Amino acid sequence: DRPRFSFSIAAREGKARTGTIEMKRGVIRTPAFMPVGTAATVKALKPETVRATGADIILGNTYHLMLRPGAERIAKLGGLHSFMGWDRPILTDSGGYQVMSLSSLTKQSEEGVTFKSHRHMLSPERSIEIQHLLGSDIVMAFDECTPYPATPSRAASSMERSMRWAKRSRDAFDSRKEQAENAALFGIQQGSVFENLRQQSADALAEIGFDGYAVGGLAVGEGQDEMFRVLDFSVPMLPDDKPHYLMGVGKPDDIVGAVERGIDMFDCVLPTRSGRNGQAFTWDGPINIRNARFSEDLKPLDSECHCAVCQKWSRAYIHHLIRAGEILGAMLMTEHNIAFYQQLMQKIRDSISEGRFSQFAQDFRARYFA
Amino acid sequence: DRPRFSFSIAAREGKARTGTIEMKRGVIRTPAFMPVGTAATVKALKPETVRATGADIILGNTYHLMLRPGAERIAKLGGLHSFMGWDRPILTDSGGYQVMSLSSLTKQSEEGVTFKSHRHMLSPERSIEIQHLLGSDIVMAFDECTPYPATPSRAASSMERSMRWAKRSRDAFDSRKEQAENAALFGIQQGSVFENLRQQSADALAEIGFDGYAVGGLAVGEGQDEMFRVLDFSVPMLPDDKPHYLMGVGKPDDIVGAVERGIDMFDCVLPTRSGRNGQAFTWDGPINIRNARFSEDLKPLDSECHCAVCQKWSRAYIHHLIRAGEILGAMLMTEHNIAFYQQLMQKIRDSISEGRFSQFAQDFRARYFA
C-alpha cells in the first residue's frame, strides 16, 4: 500500500526535476498539470474523461463548494471523491485567494476573512476543516495572496500575517488525526516580488515544516518577465527535497519556463475556461476556432495531438459547434485543451528524464511562437 | 451487404408489431425511439454515448442545418455522418414543420414556403435536395403540418396540398440516382382529426408508393385522448407491410399507447430538452431533480435503470450540478433520459416478441402513474 506522502526525484537537468509523488489514492507524475474544477466537476468532462487525458490529480474548488452545496453536506454524502466520482488525489486551495478576488464585501483581520456570498467567515482553522470535510488529499495552508503591485511595507505585513496563518494551518491539520494520517499539507510562500521577503517567508515555512511548498502571490498581473525573475531567486529558497507548486500558472510557455526554474506542480483555469470561449492550444500556438478561416478546415485541432477529439472530429465541426453555442462544442474543446496540457507535461517529463529538456524548451518556443 | 431498405415483422400482438428495418448503414430495431439532434449534434452527448444508450438511428435537424452551417457546406465537408461522427442511419425531417413553428415571417404558396431566418425558400424539390446534401438515410416528404384545431375545409385543402407535394417529393427523390439507390423515402399522412381526410391521404400516399408512412399532424395540441382516437382509425389505413412513424411523439405513456395502435417509430425532443431543465424519467414517473428533496438523496436517478449515469452518480450530485448550471449536469441528465427511452423501447420489443405486451402496458401505466 502506498504511503501518505512520498516525493521522489528520478532525474534532474539544471533546476528542472522529474519524479513522482506517491499518495494513498494514487501516484502523481511530476512536473504535473492539475486540472481545476468549478463546482465538484471539471467543466464539461466526466471524471473518466479527465483521467483519459492523462491527469493524475485535480483541484477541487473550496470557495465554490463551501457555499454550494456546502462542505458539511458533501461530507455527509461521503466526501468529494465519492460525490463527483473521482477516486484519485484531489488538491484543494484554502479559499482566501478566491474570496479576495470574487467576494463582494470583504472584512480582513488577524482571525481570517469575513465575506458576503455572491455572510461567511474563513479562518486558518475553518479552511483546514472545510478541506477535511471535502476529503482533500493535498491541503493548502490558509494564506493571503498579496495584491500586485505592493509596497515593501504592505508586502511585508501581508507575508508576516500569512506566516502566522501558516503555523495555525499546520496546527489545525495536525490536531485532526484522520486528516494528518491520510492527507498532506503544503505551505505557501508569499513576499510579492521582493527577494528578502521571499527569503523570510521560505525560512518561516521550512521552520514550521510542510509536505510541499507553493509559490504564492504570482500570476497576479506582474507579467511573465517579472514572474520568471521572482522565480529565479524564490524557488531555490524552498527545500529541494519537497515538491514546488506554482499556484495559478499558466499558459504553456509559462509552464515550460517555470519548470526550467524548479517548479514541479501547476494548476490553472486557462485550458478549461478558454476552451469554452473557442481558444484551442496547438503546438503552433493557440487558435480561436470561432474564426471563419476554420469553417471548412477538415484537419483536427492539432496535427499531432493524440487526444480522442483530434482522432475523430474536424476543426470545421468544432467551429460550427462553438458558433452554435452547442454543449458538445465545450465538451470537445475542453477535452482537447486538457489533453494538450497533459501531453506538454509528458514531453517535459520525458525530456528531463533524457537530459534534453533545455533543447525541448528551445524547440517548443521556436514553434509555438513562430 | 445490407439492402437499401427492408422492413421485416418478427412478431405481432394485436395492432403492435416488433421487427427490424435493414439499411445500408445499419439495422433499426422496431418499435424504435430516434433521438433528435439540434445542430449536427444530439445535445450534450458524443455519438458514441448516443449509441451506448441503445439508439439505432438519430434525427438530423434539416431546418437548423440548412441555415447553419448550410447544406451545401456540410456536403462539401463529406456529409452529416462524417461531419458529426455518427456512422449509423440518420432520418431527416423535411423542414416545413419547423419553418411554420419557428420562423418569424412566412409566405406559403403552392410552390413551397418562403421565410426569414431567426430570406430562404423551401419547396418539395429543395427539401429533398437539402436532405440529399446532408446524406440522410431516411428522407421525409415535404408536407404541411395542419394547425390544430382546423376546420374540415381548411384541413382538406391543407391535406390536398400535402399530397401534391408528396408526389413532387417522390419524383425529386427518384430523379437523383445516388439518393434513390442509397436512401429511403417516407410519405406523411395528414388530414387533422377527420377520418375521411385521413383515409384520402392514406390512399393518395399508397398510390404514390413510399418505403414507410408517417402519421403527421398530431402532437400539435390535441391531447392524448384525441391523438389516440385519431390513431385508432388512421394507422390501419396505412400499408401493413411498411413502417409506421408517429412524428414528434412523445412522453413514455404516449409511446406505449401508440405502439398498441400500430406505430413502429418515434422521435421527440422531450428527453433531450427536458433533461437539461431538470426532468428525469423513471419507472415511477418523471421527477424534477432540482427539487430540494433530492439534495441529499444518494440513490441513482432510477433504481432499475442500467445506464452509466445510474451506475455511478447520485441524485444528490446531479441535483447540485443542475442547480449550479454545470454542463456536466446536462450531459448526465440527457444520457440517462435517452437511455431510459431506449430501455422502454427494449421492454416494448421484448414484450411483443413474447406475447405479453398488453400486460406490460398495464403494468407500466400502473407504476408510472401511481
Ligand SMILES: CNc1nc2c(CCNCC3CCCC3)c3nc(N)[nH]c(=O)c3cc2[nH]1
Ligand atoms: C491565476 N493566478 C493565481 N492563482 C492563484 C491562487 C489560486 C490557484 N488556483 C486555485 C483554483 C482556482 C479555482 C479553484 C481552485 C493562489 N491561491 C492561494 N491560496 N495563494 C496564492 O498566493 C495564489 C496565487 C495565485 N495566482
Ligand SMILES: CNc1nc2c(CCNCC3CCCC3)c3nc(N)[nH]c(=O)c3cc2[nH]1
Ligand atoms: C412535437 N410534435 C410534432 N412534431 C411534428 C413534426 C416534426 C417531428 N420532429 C422532427 C425533429 C424536430 C427537430 C428536428 C427534427 C412533424 N414533421 C412533419 N414534417 N410533419 C408533421 O405533420 C409533423 C408533426 C409533428 N408534431
Ligand SMILES: [Cl-]
Ligand atoms: Cl478556493
Ligand SMILES: [Cl-]
Ligand atoms: Cl426540420
Ligand SMILES: [Zn+2]
Ligand atoms: Zn486534441
Ligand SMILES: [Zn+2]
Ligand atoms: Zn439511468
